[PDB]
Amino acid sequence: QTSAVQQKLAALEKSSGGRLGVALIDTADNTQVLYRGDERFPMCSTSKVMAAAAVLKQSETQKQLLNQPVEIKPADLVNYNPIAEKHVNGTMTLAELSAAALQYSDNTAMNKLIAQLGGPGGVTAFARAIGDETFRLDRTEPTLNTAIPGDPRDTTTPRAMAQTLRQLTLGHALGETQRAQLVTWLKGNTTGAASIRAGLPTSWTVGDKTGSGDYGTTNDIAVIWPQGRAPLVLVTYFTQPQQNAESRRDVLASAARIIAEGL
Ligand SMILES: [K+]
């Protein structure tokens, strides 16, 4: 069937000129709302959630892992790395790298998380270990953002990422303390106010991770605590036909508003 919400998302997508993917899980009733839910989209920096979570899982068997220092050298700097560049020729801990990756979208920090996991495939392996058969990380920063239409590298589907984000943040994919740390990090994101958050009542609390890349790719993955009801998990992915297209965070906000109005 096509629901009223799905019809509204299709009308938003038509007006945007791009390709929109949405997955909602309402954790009160476990119901889902999908739009292009099984199509692949480039993750861009939304993949930082999986990498940080994989390091948190490693930390469950190593009490001191998150305090371990990692060297930051000049050649490690990539295109966007406001936190890491301050520690060049010095160190950051894995906790500091996780926080920088998640809350500031620092790409050097992501590369250190990927390296801790043995390369992109270590992130994919963690995804598989927690039941996500769809996610794939194939490259490091910055090339994971090429976002070429039809390219499977560094993609997932909205359905898979919503399910995984639920398991990570609200379920038992991580230990208790690690889940709480991931939630704290997401809630302190600095980059999200124009994306999903912008489409929702301001009283609701959100933790999210944005992404952006070539082809005007504009993404957000969120957990949401509405006032008065069980949490929601919402994924909004958007990508456009032109390599040089501009970001469209407003489309994500519009998708979130349609979802919220449908509840
Ligand atoms: K970034």
PDB file of C-alpha atoms and ligand atoms in Angstrom:
ATOM      1  CA  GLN A   1       0.000   0.000   0.000  1.00  0.00           C
ATOM      2  CA  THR A   2       0.884   3.702  -0.260  1.00  0.00           C
ATOM      3  CA  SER A   3      -0.055   5.589   2.952  1.00  0.00           C
ATOM      4  CA  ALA A   4      -0.874   9.309   3.214  1.00  0.00           C
ATOM      5  CA  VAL A   5       2.528   9.871   4.801  1.00  0.00           C
ATOM      6  CA  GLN A   6       4.264   8.017   1.987  1.00  0.00           C
ATOM      7  CA  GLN A   7       2.324  10.062  -0.580  1.00  0.00           C
ATOM      8  CA  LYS A   8       3.426  13.305   1.127  1.00  0.00           C
ATOM      9  CA  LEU A   9       7.067  12.154   1.160  1.00  0.00           C
ATOM     10  CA  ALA A  10       6.804  11.358  -2.549  1.00  0.00           C
ATOM     11  CA  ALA A  11       5.430  14.876  -3.207  1.00  0.00           C
ATOM     12  CA  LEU A  12       8.304  16.413  -1.195  1.00  0.00           C
ATOM     13  CA  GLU A  13      10.772  14.318  -3.171  1.00  0.00           C
ATOM     14  CA  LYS A  14       9.227  15.349  -6.520  1.00  0.00           C
ATOM     15  CA  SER A  15       9.505  19.057  -5.636  1.00  0.00           C
ATOM     16  CA  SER A  16      13.134  18.643  -4.500  1.00  0.00           C
ATOM     17  CA  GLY A  17      14.387  17.062  -7.727  1.00  0.00           C
ATOM     18  CA  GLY A  18      16.408  14.499  -5.734  1.00  0.00           C
ATOM     19  CA  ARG A  19      16.005  11.068  -4.244  1.00  0.00           C
ATOM     20  CA  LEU A  20      14.746  10.771  -0.664  1.00  0.00           C
ATOM     21  CA  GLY A  21      14.928   7.768   1.668  1.00  0.00           C
ATOM     22  CA  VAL A  22      13.131   7.636   5.007  1.00  0.00           C
ATOM     23  CA  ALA A  23      12.746   5.053   7.741  1.00  0.00           C
ATOM     24  CA  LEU A  24      10.879   5.626  10.989  1.00  0.00           C
ATOM     25  CA  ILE A  25      10.585   3.147  13.859  1.00  0.00           C
ATOM     26  CA  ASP A  26       8.080   4.142  16.553  1.00  0.00           C
ATOM     27  CA  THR A  27       9.363   2.137  19.543  1.00  0.00           C
ATOM     28  CA  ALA A  28       6.079   2.160  21.444  1.00  0.00           C
ATOM     29  CA  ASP A  29       4.355  -0.071  18.878  1.00  0.00           C
ATOM     30  CA  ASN A  30       7.418  -1.057  16.780  1.00  0.00           C
ATOM     31  CA  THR A  31       5.649   0.155  13.686  1.00  0.00           C
ATOM     32  CA  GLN A  32       7.628   1.429  10.737  1.00  0.00           C
ATOM     33  CA  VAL A  33       7.128   4.011   8.066  1.00  0.00           C
ATOM     34  CA  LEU A  34       9.384   3.514   4.992  1.00  0.00           C
ATOM     35  CA  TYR A  35       9.957   5.597   1.847  1.00  0.00           C
ATOM     36  CA  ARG A  36      12.503   4.041  -0.505  1.00  0.00           C
ATOM     37  CA  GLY A  37      13.360   2.058   2.605  1.00  0.00           C
ATOM     38  CA  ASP A  38      15.297  -0.684   0.784  1.00  0.00           C
ATOM     39  CA  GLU A  39      17.144   1.566  -1.659  1.00  0.00           C
ATOM     40  CA  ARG A  40      20.825   2.315  -1.079  1.00  0.00           C
ATOM     41  CA  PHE A  41      22.146   5.757  -0.264  1.00  0.00           C
ATOM     42  CA  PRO A  42      25.666   7.071   0.447  1.00  0.00           C
ATOM     43  CA  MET A  43      26.061   7.367   4.218  1.00  0.00           C
ATOM     44  CA  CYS A  44      28.709  10.086   4.346  1.00  0.00           C
ATOM     45  CA  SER A  45      29.391  11.068   7.973  1.00  0.00           C
ATOM     46  CA  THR A  46      26.401   9.135   9.283  1.00  0.00           C
ATOM     47  CA  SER A  47      28.790   6.147   9.146  1.00  0.00           C
ATOM     48  CA  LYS A  48      30.652   7.697  12.115  1.00  0.00           C
ATOM     49  CA  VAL A  49      27.934   6.242  14.363  1.00  0.00           C
ATOM     50  CA  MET A  50      28.794   2.683  13.352  1.00  0.00           C
ATOM     51  CA  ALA A  51      32.546   3.286  13.803  1.00  0.00           C
ATOM     52  CA  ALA A  52      32.169   4.924  17.228  1.00  0.00           C
ATOM     53  CA  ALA A  53      29.821   2.133  18.317  1.00  0.00           C
ATOM     54  CA  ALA A  54      32.308  -0.525  17.145  1.00  0.00           C
ATOM     55  CA  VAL A  55      35.020   1.088  19.315  1.00  0.00           C
ATOM     56  CA  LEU A  56      32.575   1.250  22.233  1.00  0.00           C
ATOM     57  CA  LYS A  57      31.994  -2.504  21.768  1.00  0.00           C
ATOM     58  CA  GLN A  58      35.783  -3.110  21.853  1.00  0.00           C
ATOM     59  CA  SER A  59      35.895  -1.061  25.065  1.00  0.00           C
ATOM     60  CA  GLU A  60      33.551  -3.486  26.834  1.00  0.00           C
ATOM     61  CA  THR A  61      36.496  -5.915  27.165  1.00  0.00           C
ATOM     62  CA  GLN A  62      39.124  -3.082  27.769  1.00  0.00           C
ATOM     63  CA  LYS A  63      38.308  -0.688  30.587  1.00  0.00           C
ATOM     64  CA  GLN A  64      41.086   1.665  29.501  1.00  0.00           C
ATOM     65  CA  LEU A  65      40.662   1.581  25.720  1.00  0.00           C
ATOM     66  CA  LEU A  66      38.812   4.890  25.553  1.00  0.00           C
ATOM     67  CA  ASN A  67      41.705   6.562  27.351  1.00  0.00           C
ATOM     68  CA  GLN A  68      44.315   5.224  24.955  1.00  0.00           C
ATOM     69  CA  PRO A  69      46.172   7.963  23.107  1.00  0.00           C
ATOM     70  CA  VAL A  70      46.382   8.028  19.300  1.00  0.00           C
ATOM     71  CA  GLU A  71      49.038  10.059  17.468  1.00  0.00           C
ATOM     72  CA  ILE A  72      47.817  12.772  15.151  1.00  0.00           C
ATOM     73  CA  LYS A  73      50.414  13.727  12.530  1.00  0.00           C
ATOM     74  CA  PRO A  74      50.250  16.389   9.808  1.00  0.00           C
ATOM     75  CA  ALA A  75      49.776  13.837   7.066  1.00  0.00           C
ATOM     76  CA  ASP A  76      46.664  12.551   8.954  1.00  0.00           C
ATOM     77  CA  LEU A  77      44.734  15.709   8.418  1.00  0.00           C
ATOM     78  CA  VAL A  78      42.127  15.469   5.725  1.00  0.00           C
ATOM     79  CA  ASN A  79      39.520  17.935   4.517  1.00  0.00           C
ATOM     80  CA  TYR A  80      37.439  18.828   7.665  1.00  0.00           C
ATOM     81  CA  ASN A  81      38.963  18.234  11.018  1.00  0.00           C
ATOM     82  CA  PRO A  82      38.546  21.171  13.384  1.00  0.00           C
ATOM     83  CA  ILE A  83      39.312  19.157  16.502  1.00  0.00           C
ATOM     84  CA  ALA A  84      42.133  16.957  15.268  1.00  0.00           C
ATOM     85  CA  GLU A  85      44.130  19.785  13.720  1.00  0.00           C
ATOM     86  CA  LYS A  86      44.495  21.310  17.188  1.00  0.00           C
ATOM     87  CA  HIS A  87      46.343  18.149  18.334  1.00  0.00           C
ATOM     88  CA  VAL A  88      48.683  17.649  15.335  1.00  0.00           C
ATOM     89  CA  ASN A  89      52.073  16.426  16.543  1.00  0.00           C
ATOM     90  CA  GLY A  90      50.252  15.338  19.698  1.00  0.00           C
ATOM     91  CA  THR A  91      47.596  12.836  20.758  1.00  0.00           C
ATOM     92  CA  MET A  92      43.880  12.388  21.293  1.00  0.00           C
ATOM     93  CA  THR A  93      42.267   9.528  23.221  1.00  0.00           C
ATOM     94  CA  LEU A  94      39.781   7.183  21.561  1.00  0.00           C
ATOM     95  CA  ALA A  95      37.023   8.842  23.633  1.00  0.00           C
ATOM     96  CA  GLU A  96      38.161  12.257  22.366  1.00  0.00           C
ATOM     97  CA  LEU A  97      38.241  10.942  18.785  1.00  0.00           C
ATOM     98  CA  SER A  98      34.759   9.443  19.148  1.00  0.00           C
ATOM     99  CA  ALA A  99      33.356  12.686  20.563  1.00  0.00           C
ATOM    100  CA  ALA A 100      35.025  14.778  17.852  1.00  0.00           C
ATOM    101  CA  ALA A 101      33.804  12.475  15.070  1.00  0.00           C
ATOM    102  CA  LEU A 102      30.224  12.384  16.363  1.00  0.00           C
ATOM    103  CA  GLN A 103      29.695  15.911  17.670  1.00  0.00           C
ATOM    104  CA  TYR A 104      31.820  17.935  15.230  1.00  0.00           C
ATOM    105  CA  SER A 105      31.922  15.550  12.242  1.00  0.00           C
ATOM    106  CA  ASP A 106      35.743  15.541  12.387  1.00  0.00           C
ATOM    107  CA  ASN A 107      37.007  13.395   9.507  1.00  0.00           C
ATOM    108  CA  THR A 108      40.518  12.806  10.842  1.00  0.00           C
ATOM    109  CA  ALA A 109      38.900  11.506  14.025  1.00  0.00           C
ATOM    110  CA  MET A 110      36.827   9.077  11.949  1.00  0.00           C
ATOM    111  CA  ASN A 111      39.961   7.808  10.212  1.00  0.00           C
ATOM    112  CA  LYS A 112      41.501   7.023  13.621  1.00  0.00           C
ATOM    113  CA  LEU A 113      38.374   5.087  14.616  1.00  0.00           C
ATOM    114  CA  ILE A 114      38.521   3.154  11.325  1.00  0.00           C
ATOM    115  CA  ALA A 115      42.218   2.378  11.884  1.00  0.00           C
ATOM    116  CA  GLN A 116      41.512   1.140  15.434  1.00  0.00           C
ATOM    117  CA  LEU A 117      39.059  -1.299  13.853  1.00  0.00           C
ATOM    118  CA  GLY A 118      41.542  -2.556  11.214  1.00  0.00           C
ATOM    119  CA  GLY A 119      40.193  -0.588   8.273  1.00  0.00           C
ATOM    120  CA  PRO A 120      36.758   0.015   6.711  1.00  0.00           C
ATOM    121  CA  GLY A 121      35.965  -3.701   6.768  1.00  0.00           C
ATOM    122  CA  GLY A 122      36.265  -3.700  10.564  1.00  0.00           C
ATOM    123  CA  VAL A 123      33.319  -1.296  10.690  1.00  0.00           C
ATOM    124  CA  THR A 124      31.342  -3.559   8.341  1.00  0.00           C
ATOM    125  CA  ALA A 125      32.254  -6.583  10.499  1.00  0.00           C
ATOM    126  CA  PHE A 126      30.798  -4.885  13.575  1.00  0.00           C
ATOM    127  CA  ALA A 127      27.611  -4.090  11.662  1.00  0.00           C
ATOM    128  CA  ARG A 128      27.280  -7.776  10.744  1.00  0.00           C
ATOM    129  CA  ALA A 129      27.920  -8.785  14.376  1.00  0.00           C
ATOM    130  CA  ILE A 130      24.905  -6.722  15.483  1.00  0.00           C
ATOM    131  CA  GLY A 131      22.565  -8.062  12.785  1.00  0.00           C
ATOM    132  CA  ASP A 132      22.978  -5.481  10.018  1.00  0.00           C
ATOM    133  CA  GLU A 133      23.527  -7.339   6.737  1.00  0.00           C
ATOM    134  CA  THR A 134      23.191  -4.183   4.646  1.00  0.00           C
ATOM    135  CA  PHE A 135      25.692  -1.570   5.842  1.00  0.00           C
ATOM    136  CA  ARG A 136      29.061  -1.467   4.109  1.00  0.00           C
ATOM    137  CA  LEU A 137      32.065   0.756   4.709  1.00  0.00           C
ATOM    138  CA  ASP A 138      34.643   0.419   1.936  1.00  0.00           C
ATOM    139  CA  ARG A 139      36.806   3.546   2.152  1.00  0.00           C
ATOM    140  CA  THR A 140      38.231   6.055   4.608  1.00  0.00           C
ATOM    141  CA  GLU A 141      37.677   9.818   4.786  1.00  0.00           C
ATOM    142  CA  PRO A 142      37.406  11.780   2.590  1.00  0.00           C
ATOM    143  CA  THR A 143      36.790   9.425  -0.351  1.00  0.00           C
ATOM    144  CA  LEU A 144      33.830   7.719   1.377  1.00  0.00           C
ATOM    145  CA  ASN A 145      31.858  10.906   0.476  1.00  0.00           C
ATOM    146  CA  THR A 146      32.069  10.612  -3.334  1.00  0.00           C
ATOM    147  CA  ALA A 147      28.389   9.591  -3.268  1.00  0.00           C
ATOM    148  CA  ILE A 148      28.308   8.562  -6.938  1.00  0.00           C
ATOM    149  CA  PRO A 149      24.844   7.438  -8.074  1.00  0.00           C
ATOM    150  CA  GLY A 150      24.721   3.652  -8.414  1.00  0.00           C
ATOM    151  CA  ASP A 151      27.959   3.085  -6.509  1.00  0.00           C
ATOM    152  CA  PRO A 152      27.436   0.572  -3.660  1.00  0.00           C
ATOM    153  CA  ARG A 153      30.554   1.634  -1.756  1.00  0.00           C
ATOM    154  CA  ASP A 154      29.938   3.257   1.631  1.00  0.00           C
ATOM    155  CA  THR A 155      26.145   2.831   1.464  1.00  0.00           C
ATOM    156  CA  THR A 156      23.259   1.456   3.469  1.00  0.00           C
ATOM    157  CA  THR A 157      19.461   1.504   3.280  1.00  0.00           C
ATOM    158  CA  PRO A 158      17.124   3.578   5.445  1.00  0.00           C
ATOM    159  CA  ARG A 159      15.460   0.440   6.869  1.00  0.00           C
ATOM    160  CA  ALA A 160      18.775  -1.130   7.884  1.00  0.00           C
ATOM    161  CA  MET A 161      20.198   2.000   9.458  1.00  0.00           C
ATOM    162  CA  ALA A 162      17.051   2.736  11.472  1.00  0.00           C
ATOM    163  CA  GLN A 163      17.021  -0.810  12.835  1.00  0.00           C
ATOM    164  CA  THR A 164      20.707  -0.641  13.718  1.00  0.00           C
ATOM    165  CA  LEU A 165      20.415   2.797  15.322  1.00  0.00           C
ATOM    166  CA  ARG A 166      17.554   1.465  17.462  1.00  0.00           C
ATOM    167  CA  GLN A 167      19.614  -1.528  18.586  1.00  0.00           C
ATOM    168  CA  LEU A 168      22.620   0.650  19.395  1.00  0.00           C
ATOM    169  CA  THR A 169      20.848   3.426  21.288  1.00  0.00           C
ATOM    170  CA  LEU A 170      17.727   1.825  22.792  1.00  0.00           C
ATOM    171  CA  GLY A 171      18.416  -1.912  22.554  1.00  0.00           C
ATOM    172  CA  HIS A 172      21.207  -4.189  23.681  1.00  0.00           C
ATOM    173  CA  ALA A 173      23.758  -4.149  20.874  1.00  0.00           C
ATOM    174  CA  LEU A 174      26.106  -2.390  23.326  1.00  0.00           C
ATOM    175  CA  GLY A 175      26.574  -2.769  27.051  1.00  0.00           C
ATOM    176  CA  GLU A 176      24.599  -0.458  29.303  1.00  0.00           C
ATOM    177  CA  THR A 177      27.332   2.070  29.989  1.00  0.00           C
ATOM    178  CA  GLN A 178      28.409   2.099  26.335  1.00  0.00           C
ATOM    179  CA  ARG A 179      24.831   2.655  25.126  1.00  0.00           C
ATOM    180  CA  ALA A 180      24.515   5.552  27.543  1.00  0.00           C
ATOM    181  CA  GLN A 181      27.805   7.033  26.274  1.00  0.00           C
ATOM    182  CA  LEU A 182      26.663   6.792  22.653  1.00  0.00           C
ATOM    183  CA  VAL A 183      23.365   8.496  23.537  1.00  0.00           C
ATOM    184  CA  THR A 184      25.189  11.260  25.435  1.00  0.00           C
ATOM    185  CA  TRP A 185      27.430  11.854  22.409  1.00  0.00           C
ATOM    186  CA  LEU A 186      24.524  11.965  19.953  1.00  0.00           C
ATOM    187  CA  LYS A 187      22.494  14.324  22.161  1.00  0.00           C
ATOM    188  CA  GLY A 188      25.454  16.730  22.200  1.00  0.00           C
ATOM    189  CA  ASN A 189      25.816  16.904  18.427  1.00  0.00           C
ATOM    190  CA  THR A 190      26.557  20.436  17.217  1.00  0.00           C
ATOM    191  CA  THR A 191      25.592  20.002  13.546  1.00  0.00           C
ATOM    192  CA  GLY A 192      21.930  18.935  13.609  1.00  0.00           C
ATOM    193  CA  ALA A 193      19.623  21.911  14.170  1.00  0.00           C
ATOM    194  CA  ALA A 194      18.796  22.449  10.478  1.00  0.00           C
ATOM    195  CA  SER A 195      18.051  18.768   9.721  1.00  0.00           C
ATOM    196  CA  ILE A 196      15.603  16.340  11.370  1.00  0.00           C
ATOM    197  CA  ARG A 197      15.457  18.545  14.445  1.00  0.00           C
ATOM    198  CA  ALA A 198      14.078  21.446  12.487  1.00  0.00           C
ATOM    199  CA  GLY A 199      10.979  19.524  11.470  1.00  0.00           C
ATOM    200  CA  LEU A 200       9.989  18.401  14.978  1.00  0.00           C
ATOM    201  CA  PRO A 201       8.351  20.116  17.930  1.00  0.00           C
ATOM    202  CA  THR A 202      11.038  21.954  19.807  1.00  0.00           C
ATOM    203  CA  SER A 203      10.055  20.335  23.097  1.00  0.00           C
ATOM    204  CA  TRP A 204      11.267  16.963  21.859  1.00  0.00           C
ATOM    205  CA  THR A 205      14.799  15.893  22.606  1.00  0.00           C
ATOM    206  CA  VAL A 206      16.975  14.639  19.753  1.00  0.00           C
ATOM    207  CA  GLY A 207      20.295  12.951  19.404  1.00  0.00           C
ATOM    208  CA  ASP A 208      21.510  12.742  15.828  1.00  0.00           C
ATOM    209  CA  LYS A 209      24.386  12.440  13.388  1.00  0.00           C
ATOM    210  CA  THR A 210      24.329  14.373  10.107  1.00  0.00           C
ATOM    211  CA  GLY A 211      26.169  13.657   6.893  1.00  0.00           C
ATOM    212  CA  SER A 212      26.942  15.524   3.707  1.00  0.00           C
ATOM    213  CA  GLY A 213      28.906  14.719   0.582  1.00  0.00           C
ATOM    214  CA  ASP A 214      29.087  15.058  -3.168  1.00  0.00           C
ATOM    215  CA  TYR A 215      25.936  14.868  -5.294  1.00  0.00           C
ATOM    216  CA  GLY A 216      24.390  17.247  -2.779  1.00  0.00           C
ATOM    217  CA  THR A 217      24.057  14.300  -0.431  1.00  0.00           C
ATOM    218  CA  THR A 218      22.396  15.457   2.784  1.00  0.00           C
ATOM    219  CA  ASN A 219      21.634  12.957   5.537  1.00  0.00           C
ATOM    220  CA  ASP A 220      20.621  12.682   9.187  1.00  0.00           C
ATOM    221  CA  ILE A 221      20.031   9.742  11.512  1.00  0.00           C
ATOM    222  CA  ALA A 222      18.316  10.432  14.837  1.00  0.00           C
ATOM    223  CA  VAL A 223      16.888   9.159  18.007  1.00  0.00           C
ATOM    224  CA  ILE A 224      14.055  11.158  19.282  1.00  0.00           C
ATOM    225  CA  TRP A 225      12.446  11.395  22.721  1.00  0.00           C
ATOM    226  CA  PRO A 226       9.050  12.986  22.283  1.00  0.00           C
ATOM    227  CA  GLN A 227       7.317  14.454  25.241  1.00  0.00           C
ATOM    228  CA  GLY A 228       4.914  11.888  26.591  1.00  0.00           C
ATOM    229  CA  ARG A 229       5.569   8.775  24.551  1.00  0.00           C
ATOM    230  CA  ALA A 230       8.184   6.181  23.682  1.00  0.00           C
ATOM    231  CA  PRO A 231      11.217   7.156  21.589  1.00  0.00           C
ATOM    232  CA  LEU A 232      11.360   7.205  17.824  1.00  0.00           C
ATOM    233  CA  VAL A 233      14.229   6.354  15.483  1.00  0.00           C
ATOM    234  CA  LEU A 234      14.295   8.284  12.211  1.00  0.00           C
ATOM    235  CA  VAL A 235      16.641   8.069   9.207  1.00  0.00           C
ATOM    236  CA  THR A 236      16.436  10.645   6.388  1.00  0.00           C
ATOM    237  CA  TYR A 237      18.810  10.302   3.418  1.00  0.00           C
ATOM    238  CA  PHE A 238      18.816  12.569   0.377  1.00  0.00           C
ATOM    239  CA  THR A 239      20.957  12.670  -2.730  1.00  0.00           C
ATOM    240  CA  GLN A 240      20.816  14.592  -6.018  1.00  0.00           C
ATOM    241  CA  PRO A 241      21.744  14.015  -9.658  1.00  0.00           C
ATOM    242  CA  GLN A 242      24.502  16.696 -10.059  1.00  0.00           C
ATOM    243  CA  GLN A 243      27.959  16.109  -8.500  1.00  0.00           C
ATOM    244  CA  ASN A 244      28.128  19.759  -7.430  1.00  0.00           C
ATOM    245  CA  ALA A 245      24.584  20.039  -6.029  1.00  0.00           C
ATOM    246  CA  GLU A 246      24.059  22.114  -2.893  1.00  0.00           C
ATOM    247  CA  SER A 247      23.082  20.684   0.489  1.00  0.00           C
ATOM    248  CA  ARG A 248      19.360  20.480   1.203  1.00  0.00           C
ATOM    249  CA  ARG A 249      18.960  20.140   4.979  1.00  0.00           C
ATOM    250  CA  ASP A 250      15.528  21.752   4.589  1.00  0.00           C
ATOM    251  CA  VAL A 251      14.355  18.604   2.748  1.00  0.00           C
ATOM    252  CA  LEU A 252      15.296  16.504   5.754  1.00  0.00           C
ATOM    253  CA  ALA A 253      13.456  18.895   8.077  1.00  0.00           C
ATOM    254  CA  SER A 254      10.417  18.658   5.753  1.00  0.00           C
ATOM    255  CA  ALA A 255      10.531  14.855   5.799  1.00  0.00           C
ATOM    256  CA  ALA A 256      10.712  14.861   9.595  1.00  0.00           C
ATOM    257  CA  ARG A 257       7.739  17.258   9.818  1.00  0.00           C
ATOM    258  CA  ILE A 258       5.659  14.975   7.572  1.00  0.00           C
ATOM    259  CA  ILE A 259       6.579  12.002   9.776  1.00  0.00           C
ATOM    260  CA  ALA A 260       5.741  13.889  12.980  1.00  0.00           C
ATOM    261  CA  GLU A 261       2.368  15.017  11.552  1.00  0.00           C
ATOM    262  CA  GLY A 262       1.611  11.410  10.710  1.00  0.00           C
ATOM    263  CA  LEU A 263       1.970  10.020  14.177  1.00  0.00           C
TER     264      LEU A 263
HETATM  265  K     K B   1      32.249  15.524   8.186  1.00  0.00           K
END
